[PDB]
Design a binder for this molecule. Structure first.
Ligand code: A1AND
Ligand code: ZN
Length: 140
């Protein structure tokens, strides 16, 4: 689990979005595993606006933050896990690291702020859904 709180926006994994998220929906994209819902309270997080390929991510299944190198956001074949069927995913960044299902939503951060959230695991690569292209998160 985990979310990004920026302005009056809550950014979650689409697959973990609650009924309330869907009932307060701003934007969702199944190809990116992202859903954004509206918030009453303004949020504390800054989104990175950068092309960084190094950062640190939170891995709940280890209660640890790990420094990683990650690929630039792209369209990736996410292999079937114990939990979820195989599917293609856009705006996904990969690193070598550990991931479990409950790790989805863990933040990946660089010097500029939040880069993305853990979205894909179970087969040796940790995938992060990029948010840095979502400039609109920093306005309205
Ligand atoms: C973070 C993780 C670890 C292990 C399995 C699934 C995971 O993430 C969810 C996922 O891959 N999908 C396609 C919804
Ligand atoms: Zn950066």
């Amino acid at each position: 689990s985990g979310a990004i709180y920026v302005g009056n926006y809550r950014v979650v994994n689409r697959h973990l979005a609650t009924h309330n998220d869907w009932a307060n929906l701003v934007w969702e994209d199944s190809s990116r595993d992202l859903l954004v819902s509206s918030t009453t309270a303004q949020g504390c997080d800054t989104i990175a606006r950068c092309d960084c390929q190094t950062g640190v991510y939170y891995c709940s299944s280890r209660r640890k933050h790990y420094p990683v190198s990650f690929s630039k956001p792209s369209l990736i074949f996410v292999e079937a896990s114990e939990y979820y069927p195989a599917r293609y995913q856009s705006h996904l960044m990969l690193a070598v690291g550990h991931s479990e299902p409950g790790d989805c939503g863990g933040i990946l951060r660089c010097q500029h702020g939040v880069v993305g959230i853990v979205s894909t695991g179970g087969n040796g690569l940790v995938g992060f859904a990029d948010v840095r292209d979502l400039l609109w998160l920093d306005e309205e």
